[PDB]
């Protein structure tokens, strides 16, 4: 066969398609159950992706249009530049709801050639454009509000975890997926007498693990639920340990920030937005 | 008639021609005649010029190539950006003999449209790209070494100015043009008894002025010469005043720095280099 029309066209004409990705990370810490207490640190990265064949298009059209883009709903941010060569901005006043960035083309081209030598059979080359910090409030900046309670008796430990799905922390209500709840139980732990929902006790590491596939307002509970466990200890009592949660999402940012293309030459095939938990702890 | 072929071509095809100008200013102060003493402050600006019709070419080809250029023999410099929007650089390490800069095209285009509305019948639009400070040594950074001597008697003043053309302060030996030597004479001043070379006494401002058209190694003296004057004072004696020199040059910088185009899309029709005296004083 021959190459497609899409690939032929892209490798010798027009205005190029690129893809943008905003990938954010929530770090959170809850203490007791008192709202804040809660401490939040939200990180982010903005990645631009260029289709394979772009190195041929740059070899057939050696003087490319300039890539110029604009992050919208800025100012919550606090950016670095993972690649200070290849990317720049104004730097001056003030802290508007918008910021403009522009790309060093000869660099972008050398960079893409390099990545293509390293990974020839990839569909997309990702280039890290921005790194950033969103900000930073209380319990209302966290997608999933945690609250943990122990009852540590001399030979039995009782665990309650209450979780609250939180729309206020995201731009558009999207599901939380592959939610994991991990909590170490010391003491003796001989038996997991009872549990709800089902969970897995891990003998070797002495911790209990819950896997909830999706949390949302479409989901069971309506997003607000409980996990309960009861252990029998040989030693005792247990010293409470911090709960570690993990989750991922796709469809929204936590920042709300977005991206516009400025010049001509380029267009956005896709803008992907996702966030995941980083260090997401809750303590007694 | 119709437009030229140059203008037709330029307004609808190819790779654009631009012009670069490095314009420097020497500020100097000599004291007594002891070498340094001498104090030097050399300033500069780098200007990019775009031919008229460029706004039509941008209207017929809306996605232009990126302008990316590189100042060579940098590091003597110490730059600001007169237009922090439209221009950027790496900012990181270190202080190499070379630096790369790249332009915000949507801005450059809005800027050029604006200038064209303001001055439609101009041949070239100048855009201030860089401002800078060269550095900064002693008498060997000055194109024209000055040395002034007075003999202030009770009723007659004697002036000697010695000047030394200096190749060491410039990249390529070029002439100094429209050299003016202005020095105030207080006291009474009734008569300019004698003078060499010819000069003009100014009654109203009480100062003597010499105009030497060109100073060079092709020039008389070989570049090293004297101005002498003798005055008759009614009052007396004269308090010596600082000598003010003015000059201009075309053909060289004082820095030595230069400019390369990086991407494709653009080419240099002309790179013009010139320097002129700013505040260029010499004291007794």
Q: Please tell me which residue of chain B has the smallest CA distance to A262.
A: B106
Which residue in this structure is represented by tokens 């100042």? B71
Domain ranges in chain A are 1-284
Residue B34: phi and psi, rounded to 5, are: -60, 125
Direct distance between the N- and C-terminal alpha carbons of chain A, in angstroms, rounded to an integer: 64
Distances from the Cα of A67 to the Cα of A64, A90, A265, B44, B75, angstroms: 9, 15, 7, 30, 29
DSSP chain B: ----HHHHHHHSSS-EEEEEEEEEEEEEEEESSSTTT-EEEEEEEEEEEEETTHHHHHHHSSSPBPPEEEEES-SS---B-S-TTTEEE---S---SEEEEEE-HHHHHHHHHHHHHH-TT-SEEEEEEEEEE----SGGG-SEEEEEEEEE-SSEEEEEEEEEE-GGGSSS---EEEEEEEEE--S---EEEEEES--EEETTTTEEEEEEEEESSSSGGGSEEEEEEEEE-SS-------EEEEEE--S--SS--EEEE-SSSEEEEEEEEEEEEEEEEEE-
**In chain B, which residues have their Cβ closer than 8 Å to the Cβ of A84?**
90-92
Q: Is B265 on the interface with A (CB under 8 A)?
A: yes
Q: With 0-12 CB in 10 A as exposed, 13-18 as middle and 19+ as buried, what is A41?
A: middle
Q: Is A61 on the interface with B (CB under 8 A)?
A: no
Conformational region of residue B115, where left means phi above 0, alpha means psi within -120 to 50, and beta covers everything else: alpha
Q: Is the CB of B65 inside 8 Å of chain A's CB atoms? A: yes
Any CB–CB contact under 8 A between B121 and chain A?
no
Burial class (CB in 10 A: 0-12, 13-18, 19+), B197: middle
Query: What is the 8-class DSSP label of residue A66?
Result: P
3 state SS of A23: strand
SS3 A242: coil
B139: number of Cβ within 10 Å: 21
Q: Which residues pair with B258 in a beta bridge?
A: B72
The answer for residues whose C-beta is within 8 angstroms of residue A234's C-beta and 6 or more apart is A155, A187, A188, A189, A190
Q: What determination technique applies here?
A: X-ray
Closest Cα partner for B259 from B16, B68, B66?
A: B68
Residue in B139, B152, B185, B186 with CA at minimum distance from that of residue B280: B139
A-chain residues near B263 (CB < 8 A):
63, 105-106
Name residues whose C-beta falls within 8 Å of residue A55's C-beta, 6 or more positions apart in sequence: A112, A113, A116
- C-to-N gaps above 2.5 Å in chain B, after residues: none
Q: Where are the alpha helices (DSSP H) in chain A?
A: 5-11, 54-60, 105-118
Eight-class DSSP state of A65: B
Cα distance between residue B163 and residue B146, in whole Å: 5
Whether B89 has its CB under 8 Å from any CB of chain A: the answer is yes
Sign of CA dihedral B86, B67, A65, B12: positive
β pairing state of B16-31 and B266-283: parallel
Beta bridge pairs of residue A79: none
CB contact under 8 A, A64 and B66: yes
Closest Cβ–Cβ partner in B90, B106, B263 for A105: B263
Q: Distances in Å between the alpha carbon of B245 and those of A256, B191, B194?
A: 61, 23, 21
| Contact residues on chain A for B262, CB-CB shorter than 8 A | 106
Q: Give yes or no for A105 touching B (CB within 8 A).
A: yes
């Amino acid at each position: 066969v021959d190459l497609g029309t899409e690939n032929l066209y892209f490798q010798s004409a027009d205005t190029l398609p690129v893809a943008a990705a905003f990938t954010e990370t929530v770090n959170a810490y809850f203490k007791g159950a008192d709202p804040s207490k809660c401490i939040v640190k939200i990180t982010g990265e903005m990645v631009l992706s260029f289709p394979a064949g772009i190195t041929r298009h740059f070899a057939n059209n050696p003087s490319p249009a300039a890539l110029t883009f604009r992050v919208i709903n800025f100012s919550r941010l606090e950016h670095v530049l993972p690649n200070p060569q290849l990317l720049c901005c104004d730097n001056t006043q003030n802290d508007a709801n918008t910021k403009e960035f522009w790309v060093n083309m000869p660099n972008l081209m050398t960079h893409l050639k390099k990545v293509s030598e390293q990974k020839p059979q990839a569909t997309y080359y990702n280039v890290d454009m921005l790194k950033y910090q969103v900000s930073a409030q209380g319990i209302q900046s966290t997608p999933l509000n945690l609250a943990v309670n122990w009852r540590c008796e001399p030979s039995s430990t009782d665990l309650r975890i209450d979780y609250k799905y939180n729309t206020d922390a995201m731009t558009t209500a999207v599901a939380l997926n592959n939610v994991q709840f991990l909590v170490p139980i010391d003491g003796g732990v001989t038996k997991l007498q009872a549990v709800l929902p089902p969970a897995v006790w891990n003998a070797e590491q002495q911790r209990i693990l819950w896997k909830i596939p999706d949390i949302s307002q479409k989901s069971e509970n309506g997003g607000v639920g409980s996990l309960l466990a009861r252990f029998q200890l040989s030693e005792g009592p247990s010293k409470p340990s911090p709960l570690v949660v993990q989750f991922t999402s796709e469809g929204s940012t936590l920042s709300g920030c977005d991206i516009e293309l400025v010049g001509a030459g380029y267009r956005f095939s896709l803008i992907k937005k996702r966030f995941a938990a980083g260090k997401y702890l809750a303590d007694n």
